[PDB]
Amino acid sequence: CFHPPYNNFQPDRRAVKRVGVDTGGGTVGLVASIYRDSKRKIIRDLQKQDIQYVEYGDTRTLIIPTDKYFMFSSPRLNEICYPGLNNVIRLLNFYPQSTIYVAGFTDNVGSRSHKRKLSQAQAETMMTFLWANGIAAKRLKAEGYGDKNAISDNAIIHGSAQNRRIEIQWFTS
Amino acid sequence: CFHPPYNNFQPDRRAVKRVGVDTGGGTVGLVASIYRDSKRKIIRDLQKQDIQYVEYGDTRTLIIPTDKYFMFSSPRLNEICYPGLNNVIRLLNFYPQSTIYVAGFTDNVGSRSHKRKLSQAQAETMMTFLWANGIAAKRLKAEGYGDKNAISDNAIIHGSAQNRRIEIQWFTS
Amino acid sequence: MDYVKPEAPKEIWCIYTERGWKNGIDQANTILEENIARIKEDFGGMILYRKLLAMNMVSPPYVSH
Amino acid sequence: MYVRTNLTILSPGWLASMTSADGTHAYEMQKSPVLLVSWHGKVMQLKVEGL
Amino acid sequence: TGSLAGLQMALKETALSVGAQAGLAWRAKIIDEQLNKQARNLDAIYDFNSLVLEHNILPPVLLEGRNTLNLADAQSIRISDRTYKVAKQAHFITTPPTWRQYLW
Amino acid sequence: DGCCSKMGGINYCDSSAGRLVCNNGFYSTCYCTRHAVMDLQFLMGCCLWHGGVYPQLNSSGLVVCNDGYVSEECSLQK
Amino acid sequence: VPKLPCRVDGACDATIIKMMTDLNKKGIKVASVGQNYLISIPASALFADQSPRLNWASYSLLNEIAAFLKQFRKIAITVTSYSSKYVSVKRERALTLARSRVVSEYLWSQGVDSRIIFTQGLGSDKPITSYTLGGDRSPNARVEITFRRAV
Amino acid sequence: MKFKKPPINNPSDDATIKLAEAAVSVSDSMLEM
Amino acid sequence: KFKKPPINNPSDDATIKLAEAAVSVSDSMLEM
Amino acid sequence: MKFKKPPINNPSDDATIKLAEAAVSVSDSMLEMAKVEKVITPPSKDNTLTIPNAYNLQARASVDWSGPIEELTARIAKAAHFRFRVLGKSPSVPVLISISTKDESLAEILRDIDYQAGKKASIHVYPNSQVVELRYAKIY
Amino acid sequence: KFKKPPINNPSDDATIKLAEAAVSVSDSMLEMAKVEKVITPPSKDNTLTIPNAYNLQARASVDWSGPIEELTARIAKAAHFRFRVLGKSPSVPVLISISTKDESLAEILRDIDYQAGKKASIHVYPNSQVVELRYAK
Predict the structure, then answer these.
(1) Paired residues of J134 in beta bridges
(2) What number of C-beta contacts closer than 8 Å exist between D and F?
(3) What CA–CA distance (Å, rounded) separates G61 from A61?
(4) Distance CA C6, CA G10 (A)
(5) How many angstroms separate the CA atoms of K31 and K39, rounded?
(6) Residue G103 neighbours by CB under 8 Å, 6+ apart
(7) Which of A13, E25, E41, K128 places its Cα 20 to 30 Å from the Cα of E54?
(8) Backbone discontinuities in chain A, residue before each (C to N > 2.5 A)
(9) What does the alpha-carbon distance between residue G97 and residue G122 come to, in Å, rounded to a whole number?
(10) What are the chain J neighbours of E67 within 8 Å (beta carbons)?
């Protein structure tokens, strides 16, 4: 079956469950499996949760809100939102040659050293979670920027909520 | 039969009365006897009177209120409450190897020497009552603490009533 | 803010009762905003005092016992 | 108002105060229908009628 | 009252006036019975007879306050550590006082 | 109504703590005097944190507190 | 009377008796002497084999215990963890401290209205039983939560 | 497994509560002097 | 066949405290 | 291809909006003035000298307290198995503290209390005698 | 099976902003207190240490609010010591206040020295069994 905290970092044998409830037809179980392990349904599942995906050229980017995937003002990872993290591992499993950059961003409230240190901690936590699921250490790099290059306006409430985020970029070659 | 003041410190032949009123059936008299000489009904009878029993690990403790088992402000033993004392002897008859500690506690009203002396007197009286029912002198020890380590709050009436007590601890080995 | 429960009480009655409801809500929000300004005044004035005492433009109070 | 208690009065501000040997406090203050007190690290309110 | 959907007596005082007196008298009786039951303990506790001075003089009554502060107005405060006051003065008596003039 | 339910019923009101005592030796959750520690955080009335309502009767609807502040909030509108 | 509260909120005597009875049948020991209360939990129902990692299903038990603790009024709680002897004194002192830290954090995350929570881990220093044959299955590897009911 | 705590006395009167509370303070003032 | 308790016995958790206070005050009186 | 932007939280109250807007301005005023005070008078000494640590000062605590200082310090000393001592006379206007932390050691709890006491009281720890000592200031 | 979220969690984009502002303000208070507070090193602290003689470990119970000389003389007499005074008593006497239920005489002496301040000092000689109160010039 499935162990809810990260399945002991083992790949879950997901397809056999569908082909067991459908043989308990084999062809219908194979069609349901080959639909849900495809890339577009995984992309739609990240769309169903609060994670944004942007593809432009051969550069791909994931945008993750710290509001739902971290506990408040800490580098601890929020354990109720494990389906999103498992879907991130499943999507990242499709590109086994590229290099990964993870970058952390906060808003403008507080002191500068505080913002930089919190960003660095959160980026390292997400990089460590990526490394512990099988990805080799030579493919990864984490960086924490402060309020360096924002994407919304910090003088309003919703845009300031949209500014606190984690960026994941990766190439193809 | 039964002599109400302590049966002249003799073990009362209790089972024969039940098997005489039931033969006057033998099997029903044996089932009633083997139920009421069991440990759980004796524990429930101390529960029916005002005596508390606590078991945790291999240490066992009896809590006795001086309010019902002593006369007021004296080391004299209250003779109307003899069923509870007989049940204490019956329960203590089951552990013939352990050593016994009896400790006495009062509340906070009065002088310190008065509290200590009254505690010491009450603990000795209960130890002497235990020794006179057959238990050897090398298995017993009595100590009287004052208001040393209370279990309730002394600034309120019911908790102060709950603080005046006798503690009996014993081991297994 | 101060609360006392008011227990002291049809073609076009509903719309104007509703408009009065909106007016009361807007008035309460305005009152709260002035209160916020007042607390900000007291705290900011004291904080500014600490900065000017540090930068040596005011004198401290002198006390005798 | 003259208030006799052994809690600690925090908010409305008193004019004079005395203490006994066992820890009872006595306060003289201006009239107000509410008092803010600290019990054991917890802030709460006491309600005064009859004013 | 409430929301948009929510918006969209002489026997009274005669009942209170007969209830207050009956409750007061009944509780007064019960208080007196409890006082009369415990009459020897209160005599042992409030033993005025063994506080009397040499020529049958009742001792004076003194009051104590500790850790005193007064904020007289803005710009002035006065503090003290202890204060002692003579509330009542000594005098001759013929009989000692008893608890019954206070508690009954 | 039922204070000491699944216990023996009400024994008495302990006024030193302001609580009822059940017929086993447990303190109840019910209060029995007004000088008990209740955790009051929400109070009604107006001119709180001032002196209360200055009790003159006014021709207009203004409500004035005992320290000169005027409650515009409890005042009736025109 | 209609506007004063009539009891401490969210609390009922039948609910206290019901939950205490259910916890004692499940196996968590709940005891009361005077006004002091003790809850004793075996370590096997909470942790893995001597690691400070909770199972996913034991959070229901911690939720049940938090729902019990919200029924009272209190000032301080103490959580202490004890284990059994494996390698040295230091390894289980660190283990018990980590276990108590995690458990008291989840209890503080839920809404227990205490002013102080103290946490300590004593290692394998104070055994309540001379039978030391189990590992983490032993009855003397446990966590104990003690408090005093205030007024 | 009915839970019970040992001292269960007769019911008390609040006058006796107040008198007892006054008497304890009289007694330890007396002790000190 | 029968024993009775004392007729004025402090069978009340407020009365008990009252009687203890009454004992200690008179003890202090003998010492003074 | 439904379009969505990531932070979708619960709805907000405009009172909380106004409160947040006031709090941000208070916060950077505090930050700027604290920078100025640090620049003007640089501190030289640390209270690790007066409060060193020991074994069984490493038990941990999480605390929410809003009262006078003395009872809380007594609770910490009792949890640390130390004797508690008071020097000087308590003032008539009480010394109030306010601590709201989560999971820190008892030595740091005492050091934070020592910093909040300011010019009114001080904390000293003697580990060889196992004594926590709180002394009041000779003011008034 | 179940892992609920924290009950008072900032799950609101205005409430969030309020809580970090509350974090940063308290950070600034700790910084200001650390700059402003003055301490003394434990080497040069002018307070009389505990003299650890055998006679000064006896327990006592003292209520006093008055002059320093009488109380120190009684403490010395209770410890079977001698007592001597060096200096001149001022016009306004030095007033202390001691209220304890259970305390040893050495720390009572330590509190006497702390409360005396700069005007007087207490010295203990344990070989020649004496305590000495020295005034300030």
Answers:
(1) J86, J123
(2) 29
(3) 41
(4) 28
(5) 16
(6) G46, G62, G79, G81, G143
(7) E41
(8) 24
(9) 8
(10) 89-90, 92
Which helix (H) or strand (E) segment is K85 a member of?
A: strand K82-86
Which residues, other chains included, contact I11 with Cβ-Cβ below 8 Å and sequence gap of 6+? H9, H10, I5
Pull the structure tokens for residue J19. Answer: 């409160």
Q: Which residues contact B147 (CB under 8 A, 6 or more apart)?
A: B105, B106, B107, B108, B115, B154, B163
Distance (Å) from the alpha carbon of E91 to chain I's nearest alpha carbon: 23
List all residues of chain F from 27 to 56 with a beta carbon under 8 Å from chain D.
37, 39-41, 43, 45, 47-52
Q: Which residue of G has its CA nearest to H7?
A: G34
Query: Across-strand partners of J121?
Result: J136
Residues of E in contact with C4 (CB under 8 A): none
Interchain CB contact of J14 with C (< 8 Å): yes
Could you tell me the resolution of this structure in angstroms? Answer: 3.8
Q: Do F40 and D47 touch (CB under 8 A)?
A: yes
D6 lies within 8 A of chain E by CB: no
Residue J83: which of K103, K39, K60 has the closest Cα?
K103
**Hunting for tokens 């409230």 — which residue is that?**
A109
Evaluate whether chains H and I are touching (3 or more beta carbon pairs less than 8 Å apart). Answer: yes
Using CB atoms, list chains with 3+ pairs below 8 Å to chain C. E, F, J
Rounded to the nearest 10 degrees, how much is the dihedral formed by the CA atoms of G89, G91, G93, G95? -150
Tokens of H15: 């006058």
Q: Which two tokens stand for residue J67?
A: 């009262």
**Residues in chain I after which the chain is broken, C→N over 2.5 Å:** none
| Distances, alpha carbon G94 to alpha carbons G88, G119, J105, in Å | 11, 13, 15
Residues pairing with D37 in the sheet:
D9, D44
Tokens of J103: 């999971």
Hey, what are J55's tokens?
């074994």
For residue F40, the distance in angstroms to the closest alpha carbon of chain D comes to 6
Phi and psi angles of residue A160, each rounded to the nearest 5 degrees, phi first: -65, -35
Max distance between CA atoms of chain J, in angstroms, equals 74
The amino acid that residue A169 corresponds to is: Q
Q: Which two tokens stand for residue H22?
A: 């006054």
> Per the structure block, which two tokens stand in for K83?
């007592």
SS3 at position E38: coil
| 3-class DSSP assignment, residue B38 | coil
Contact predicate E33/E104, CB 8 Å: no
Let me know the angle formed at the C-alpha of G110 by G108 and G114, rounded to the nearest 5 degrees: 50
Contact criterion met (CB < 8 Å) for F6 and G18? yes
Using what technique was this structure determined?
cryo-EM
DSSP letter string over K13-28? Answer: HHHHHHHHHHHHHHHH
Cα(J4)–Cα(K16) distance, integer angstroms: 21
Q: Identify the residue whose tokens are 């990240």.
A: A46
CB contact (8 A) between residue J61 and residue G78: no
CB proximity list for E81: less than 8 A, separation 6 or greater: E66, E67, E68, J89, K65, K95, K97
Q: Is B160 on the interface with I (CB under 8 A)?
A: yes
Whether the CB-CB separation of C56 and J39 falls below 8 Å is answered with no
Q: Which residues of J touch D39 (CB under 8 A)?
A: 67
Q: Is D15 on the interface with E (CB under 8 A)?
A: yes
